[PDB]
Structures are given as structure tokens and as C-alpha cells.
């Protein structure tokens, strides 16, 4: 058995909320039709902007990419390189304030993924979407899918209502660990405060670049609050959030931990080490690490060659493509870790 090439972040796009009806109870299905079916399509990848879909993508009757398994599989697997792909559906159930409806639609969304995606091609896996406004309901949604091994990780958004290390959110980490599932943070958010500590970014471009700041906050919260000692099998995947910001954050957080360790005495290993050992990052976007020598440089600055895992971020369009990362390194060994070995730690998927 050889570790498989896993595309660690691809997207399924819900056509409309009507696609959820076959998976909702009659109360919720009737409600949704009576409400005129407002769509929680997010603005994280605005559907008309250059990032939403690359030009070479298969599209449905309305011009939209990645709304059917048939279109995604046709594109993602065309060139024979990829063995499996991890599907994340970003349909904005986490922005549903009504907590019952958040629960119902998250559940329906996972049903939709299972029946119309995972059932349709055995090369697909998926994250579990959870109603993260009720952490205890989020744990129950992890549990509900924990027997279906095609669901391989738990989806959380980069910007939450409360930091993910707060005890309030411990049921999510505990259920994820108990089910043997890594937790992924994906760009996006619940927008229950300003997306930055200094207010509301005025453009999508400003917002998209700046969400790395929130991932520093989440990682510092998760580690300082003790998640990695309390739930020591935790694995965290950062999906589509960059990674070049990680070293300067790791260094500062290590520096200050040497002074403040008695404030968090359960953290007896450096963050540096804890991050290298517990955190993985997808490679799309590469944020310039694809330029000559820059992937070797960032791996050196990370101090680990185990963190980068391959993704295409299909169908999204980035300045460099899924395998342009090869331009940034001279090491076949590193490329083998990024393309298959690193992800084996997350999913244990063999060819």
C-alpha cells in the first residue's frame, strides 16, 4: 500500500436551497418554500469574480462550475494524477442565526453531499459541515456522520463567533477526536463581529487577504487554551488560508511563551513544535511560495516538511495553478511529501 495523492481541498457548490428539500423534514421543507427559499450562498468567493471559477471548468445550465459531482469529477480527475479529493461545501449554514434551522440545514447539506456526491464517485471524500453556533449540536452532527468513513474531517470557518479554544467550543474538538477526524479551518466566516480587530474590510480583496490574521488568533487560542493537551490526537488542517504567514507567527508565539508559560503551564512543549506536529496546510493558494526556491525557503522557515499538503482548490482560480508549486523546490522528496505522504497523516488513504 502506497499513500495516495489526495487533493485536500475541492469545492461542491449548492445550486440553490431547493437542492436541500429532499433531505429536510416536512416542517423545514415546507418552511423553506414558504420563506421563498432565501439562499445562504456565501460571499467568500463572489460568483462573478475572477476567483470563483477557472475558465477551463465544466459548467451547468446556468454557467456555474462545481454544482454537480459529474462536472467536478470530470475536471478534477481528468489528467489521472489525483487519486482522491476532499470535498468542502461552503454553503453558508453557519450564518443562519436561527439555531434550529442551522442544525436542520447543516444536516440536510451533509445528506446532499453524501447522496449526490460521495455516492456518485468513490474517489470523493468530504468534510462534515456543522452548526457551529451550538457547539453541542455541532458535536452531535460529527457523531451523526462518524460511522460513514467517506467523511474524513470536520469543517469549521476561519472566523467563528468565539475563538475555537474557548471552553464553549471544546465539545467540537472532543467529538472530532473521538471520531478520529482532523478539524479543518477554511477561509470564510460567520461575520458576527468585524472580520478584523480594526473594523470591517471595505472590499472582498481586502477581506480575503486579511483572514490570515484570524487564523493566527485561532491557533493561538487552540494551543494556549490547552486543546492539544486535552485532546492530544487533534489534527488541524488549514484549508485555503495561505501558509507563508506561519513562521513569523510561530516565532513570536514561541518567544512570548518563554515568558508567559506559567500563565498556561499545561503547554510544556514549544508552540513551534506543537504547530509543526499538529497543524497541516493546503497549498492552494501558494501565495508566492511557487516562485523559484520559495517553497524550499518556506519549508526551512516552518522548520518542518510535514505540514504542506496538496490541494487544487477546484474550482477556484488563483494566480498560480495546483502543480506550479514544483517550481519553488528542487527536492523530489519534498514534492512526494506534499503530494502524498503528508496527507496520509490526515486520512490514511492508500492508492
Amino acid at each position: 500500500g502506497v499513500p495516495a495523492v489526495v487533493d485536500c481541498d475541492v469545492h461542491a457548490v449548492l445550486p440553490s436551497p431547493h437542492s436541500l428539500i429532499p433531505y429536510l423534514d416536512e416542517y423545514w421543507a415546507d418552511q423553506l418554500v414558504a420563506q421563498l427559499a432565501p439562499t445562504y450562498e456565501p460571499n467568500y468567493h463572489p460568483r462573478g469574480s475572477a476567483i470563483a471559477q477557472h475558465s477551463d471548468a465544466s459548467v451547468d445550465e446556468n454557467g456555474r462550475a462545481a454544482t454537480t459531482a459529474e462536472n467536478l469529477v470530470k475536471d478534477v480527475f481528468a489528467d489521472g494524477f489525483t487519486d482522491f479529493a476532499v470535498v468542502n461545501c461552503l454553503y453558508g449554514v453557519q450564518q443562519i442565526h436561527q439555531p434550529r434551522r442551522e442544525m436542520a440545514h447543516a444536516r440536510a447539506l451533509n445528506h446532499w453531499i453524501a447522496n449526490e456526491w460521495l455516492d456518485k464517485d468513490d474517489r470523493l471524500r468530504a468534510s462534515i459541515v456543522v452548526p457551529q453556533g451550538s457547539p453541542r449540536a455541532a458535536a452531535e452532527e460529527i457523531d451523526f456522520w462518524s460511522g460513514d468513513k467517506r467523511f474524513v474531517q470536520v469543517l469549521l470557518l476561519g472566523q467563528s463567533e468565539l475563538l475555537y479554544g474557548r471552553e464553549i467550543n471544546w465539545p467540537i474538538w472532543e467529538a472530532a477526536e473521538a471520531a478520529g477526524l482532523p478539524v479543518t479551518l477554511h477561509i470564510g466566516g460567520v461575520f458576527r463581529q468585524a472580520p478584523t480587530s480594526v473594523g470591517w474590510p471595505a472590499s472582498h480583496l481586502e477581506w480575503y487577504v486579511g483572514q490570515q490574521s484570524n487564523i493566527e488568533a485561532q491557533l493561538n487560542s487552540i494551543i494556549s487554551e490547552g486543546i492539544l493537551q486535552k485532546f492530544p490526537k487533534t489534527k488541524i488542517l488549514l484549508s485555503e488560508l495561505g501558509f507563508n504567514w506561519l513562521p513569523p507567527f510561530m516565532w513570536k508565539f514561541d518567544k512570548l511563551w518563554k515568558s508567559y508559560r506559567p500563565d498556561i503551564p499545561w503547554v510544556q512543549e514549544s508552540p513551534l513544535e506543537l504547530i509543526r506536529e499538529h497543524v497541516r496546510v493546503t497549498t492552494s493558494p501558494s501565495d508566492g511560495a511557487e516562485e523559484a526556491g520559495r517553497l524550499d525557503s518556506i519549508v526551512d522557515r516552518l522548520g518542518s516538511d510535514r505540514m504542506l499538503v496538496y490541494s487544487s482548490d477546484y474550482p477556484h482560480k488563483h494566480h498560480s495553478g495546483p502543480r506550479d508549486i514544483e517550481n519553488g523546490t528542487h527536492s523530489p522528496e519534498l514534492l512526494d511529501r506534499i503530494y502524498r505522504r503528508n496527507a496520509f497523516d490526515l486520512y490514511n488513504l492508500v492508492v
Partner: protein
Amino acid sequence: EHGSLGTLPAPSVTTGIVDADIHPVPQDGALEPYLDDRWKKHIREYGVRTTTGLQFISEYPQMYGGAMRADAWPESGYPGSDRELLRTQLLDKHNIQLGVLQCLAPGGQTLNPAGQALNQELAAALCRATNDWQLEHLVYPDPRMRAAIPVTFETPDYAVAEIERVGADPGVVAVLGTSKTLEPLGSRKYWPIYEASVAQNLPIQFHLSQGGGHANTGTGWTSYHTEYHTGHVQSFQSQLLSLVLSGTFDRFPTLKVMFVEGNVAHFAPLIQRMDYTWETLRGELPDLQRKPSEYIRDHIWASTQPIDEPEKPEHLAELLEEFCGDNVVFATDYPHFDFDDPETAFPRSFPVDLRDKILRGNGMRFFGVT
């Protein structure tokens, strides 16, 4: 400053160095000669209300010994409240010829930045009193020190009025804001302040702050002190993205801004990601005249303290140069506990020429020293 007013000579950096972040504090009652009677009464009866529910402290009070170095305490007052101690322990000891005062605390019972007082008329009076005080007590007695004048960024009218009042004084070298604001700093709200600073040929320094009106991260309030202190760099990241992507430097092509005590190295992969994203998504901002990272050399500076400490020391010089090697300026943050010494701040293998211009030529260019 676009017409100077006063006979005090402009600063001269010849053989000494520049220190871009020094924290003096007024002795108790030292601001009262400069405050209207109505504000002294107000403070006695209400303190200085800000974005907390706390009478006397900020929402994240300091941990070990108020976060001051244990050797910088005078006979009587807080660290930084003794002018002679600061002259011998800092200005003489490290031959600082341009030390920039960054007064963000009126002093006694109140340690929050004047500008953040929720009563903005009180905020403007505290900022003004601070500027009168620091010019008379520190700068003019020892003009090695120069003032970065705090103003009320959240009420631009009052800030413009203060910049016009003292912004041409040769004892003043910068306008002093905070790292946290209610709107990101590229917002049109702050443009009248940038205009007034430009008219006085003054650069702007934004120092690390709490407050601002939002949580200290974009995704909730922090719990532990590692989260609080490390989390400060996030505000600077957000402010850099806003100031650049807003086209603020298109409108103000001579405006110079420095991020003070926001670290340096993280800016380089941030700018790198900004350019990469902009390559795809630039069509959203068609009026932005330059590629985002080209604004850096002309517009964005950063101070050193606290020095980034990579595991492999060779990475420091690389990331500083990836940010911009001409725009990194030395600072001690006297008298805070993570104070940086110019003799030991840099790692043994640091390039000497980069080090020299961080200590001298880079700050001289930022502050207009010629």
C-alpha cells in the same frame, strides 16, 4: 514642518542612532497646568471612560510588574516618569541623538491612550495637554528627544485642529495614532488627518494599542496572555491591507506611515499574499494605481522592537529585506520589559550595513532628517 514655527533646530543624527519608540509618562498632576478646569473636574468625578466596563484598568492589564523592566523604576514615580533617569539610563547610555517620544498615557490612575477616551472632547483636551507637557518638560530641555503628538483619530476635526496648532513646532516629528481603530485606517474618515499631516510635512506613527471598539482579533476576544500579546500583530496586518488597498497613498502620495511595535517579519509574507491575491482579484479595485507591494518603499515603515527571533537567525535579515530593508527603523521601547538594546538586539550574523541603516539612515529618512 511646511513652514516651521520656532527657533529650535532640526534634529541631527551624525554618530548616534535613532530610537523610534520611547514611552515617557507625566508625573501625577503634570498635565493639570494644561487642562481646562472643566476637564480636571470631569476626570476627578468620572475618570477617563473608554471602551471597557472598568474604572481604572484596560481590558487586558499587564502581567509581570506592569510589563516594565525591573531596573527602570525611579525614587517615586512610574517607569518613564523621571527625566534625568531617562537621560542617563537611555539617551546617554545608547548615544541616542533622535529619540521619538510616544506618549499614550496621560498618567496617574489612567493608562489608556488619550485618543481612546469615549468622551472625544475630553480626549482632545488630554491629547493637547500631553503635547504641551512633553514639549515643555522633555523635548525643549533635551532636544535629542522629539514628540510624536497624539491626536484624536476618531474625531478628525479635533485632530486636524491639533496638528495645525503644534504640527509646525520643530520639537514635533510625527503624528501619533493607535493600532486599533473603529474603521480600518484607509477609510475616508481619516483622510482629513492625513491631509493635515501632509500639509505640515509630518509622517504618522501608529503604536500598538488595545481598545478601538472591536475585539482584539477579528474572531473573538483572547483569553491568555500569549494570545493577547502575540495577537497585537493582527491589528497591524489589517491596517496595512486597508491603507494600501484603499488607495490612501494614491490620494496622499507623500504620506509616510510607520507601524510601531507591531513586529516586522510578518509584514513580508502578508504583502506577498496581498500581491498574489491581487493578481487575480485586482479588477475589484480598478482605481488602485500601483501593484500593492509597490506602495511599501514610499509609504510603509516599521520599527524593530520587539525584534523577531527566528529559530535560524539568518531568516531575520531575509524577511526584513523581503519587507523593505530601507524602511526598518530601530527602537528600544524604553522602559518596557521586552526593551531592545542596540548592542544586543541583532543576531550575531546580521549584516552590518543593514544594521547600520536600521540604526541611522532609515529613521533619518522617515523623520525627514537631512
